[PDB]
Design a protein. Structure first.
Ligand SMILES: Nc1nc2c(ncn2[C@@H]2O[C@@H]3COP(=O)(O)O[C@H]4[C@@H](O)[C@H](n5cnc6c(=O)[nH]c(N)nc65)O[C@@H]4COP(=O)(O)O[C@H]3[C@H]2O)c(=O)[nH]1
Ligand SMILES: Nc1nc2c(ncn2[C@@H]2O[C@@H]3COP(=O)(O)O[C@H]4[C@@H](O)[C@H](n5cnc6c(=O)[nH]c(N)nc65)O[C@@H]4COP(=O)(O)O[C@H]3[C@H]2O)c(=O)[nH]1
Ligand SMILES: Nc1nc2c(ncn2[C@@H]2O[C@@H]3COP(=O)(O)O[C@H]4[C@@H](O)[C@H](n5cnc6c(=O)[nH]c(N)nc65)O[C@@H]4COP(=O)(O)O[C@H]3[C@H]2O)c(=O)[nH]1
Ligand SMILES: Nc1nc2c(ncn2[C@@H]2O[C@@H]3COP(=O)(O)O[C@H]4[C@@H](O)[C@H](n5cnc6c(=O)[nH]c(N)nc65)O[C@@H]4COP(=O)(O)O[C@H]3[C@H]2O)c(=O)[nH]1
Lengths: 73, 79
């Protein structure tokens, strides 16, 4: 199920909560030279990486991304 | 050292030589829904995959793609 991230909502999620997601997204945009401001799709196994970054389980990370509306159900 | 395949050029290579590469590209394009039909950039690690499909070393495989005009000569530095 596509990990397609809304960078708009991402940009307005409280940092307190979303700073590591934003910095991860940013290193991918930089690697890619992909600077569109709207959407970032990322690899399925990048979910596992973000989960480590947040020290959460994938499933928890997922629910939290949905809740900020950065990912869709 | 980007691996960028030239699709127009690929389509001209005879199937008995380039067929496994053409099916690989079409499989990636399908997986992506990417039908620009001009260029296909692929992962560094996908060189390994094509080399396995061709039963060639990565060096041999890359030389072949350059000879077909499908990879620019850059790609040498990827192995
Ligand atoms: N997931 C995703 N990422 C996207 C999309 N559009 C653009 N990008 C990203 O944005 C970078 C720059 O895109 P571009 O310069 O406007 O424009 C491109 C594009 O015109 C062309 N290009 C190179 N390779 C490919 C390819 O495999 N497919 C397509 N459709 N275009 C490519 O070369 C430039 C740079 O390509 P890249 O190195 O791939 O780098 C791309 C890629 O990382 C998209 O629809 N989905
Ligand atoms: N810049 C960017 N746009 C994104 C991203 N995710 C989704 N999109 C948008 O959603 C469509 C499909 O993205 P996709 O699943 O990456 O699937 C894309 C992707 O696989 C590929 N693609 C398009 N442009 C590029 C490119 O510049 N470089 C590469 N490497 N692939 C590309 O073509 C497929 C279809 O592209 P489109 O339908 O025309 O247009 C896109 C694009 O408008 C993203 O991370 N970055
Ligand atoms: N080995 C290999 N497999 C490929 C390739 N292109 C597509 N696939 C497979 O096709 C899936 C969908 O690709 P996408 O629609 O462009 O959907 C892509 C896409 O938009 C984006 N994406 C992943 N990696 C890159 C990348 O290196 N550059 C760019 N610009 N976008 C990426 O995240 C998505 C989800 O990625 P995955 O979960 O890996 O999901 C990928 C992957 O399993 C390829 O060049 N090589
Ligand atoms: N549409 C589509 N294109 C794909 C996909 N996978 C690879 N590509 C294309 O192949 C190029 C090289 O992929 P790479 O060697 O994995 O080299 C990639 C890679 O190591 C890293 N990277 C980019 N996006 C992602 C991502 O979403 N996840 C991860 N884990 N790494 C990424 O940055 C490098 C440069 O990325 P780009 O300049 O976009 O350059 C990408 C791109 O144009 C895919 O799944 N979908």
């Amino acid at each position: 199920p596509k990990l397609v991230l809304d960078l708009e909502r991402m940009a307005h999620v409280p940092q307190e909560k979303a700073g590591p997601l934003q910095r991860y997204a940013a290193t991918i945009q930089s690697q890619r030279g992909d600077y569109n401001g709207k959407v970032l799709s990322i690899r399925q196994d990048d979910l596992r990486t973000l989960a480590v970054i947040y020290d959460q389980s994938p499933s928890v990370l997922t629910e939290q991304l949905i809740s900020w509306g950065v990912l869709d159900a």
